[PDB]
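pasting for ref
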Amino acid sequence: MVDLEQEFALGGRCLAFHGPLMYEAKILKIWDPSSKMYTSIPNDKPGGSSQATKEIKPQKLGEDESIPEEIINGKCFFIHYQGWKSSWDEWVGYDRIRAYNEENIAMKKRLANEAKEAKK
């Protein structure tokens, strides 16, 4: 019984396919296409009144959060690409996201060596 649906969650470490390759990233906001809300995590907050930024309930996509329709209905994950910066905080779904383990990464290794050697 592989509980992979738990490794891609709140602050979960996962791999995501940026183009043709897998990268390490930290999930900051989970996306549920059933409500069209997403579940973020409160940590880097400027304080807040009380529950304002302490209890992240499923919040609907704001006006500057429009997620690509190709991934909006496929459970997305607003991650922050590890190794880059906040300027690379992108939405990755089960379409590009994987589980950060010794198997998917094992591919990533070969992948960053093979998808990088491909000459055509």
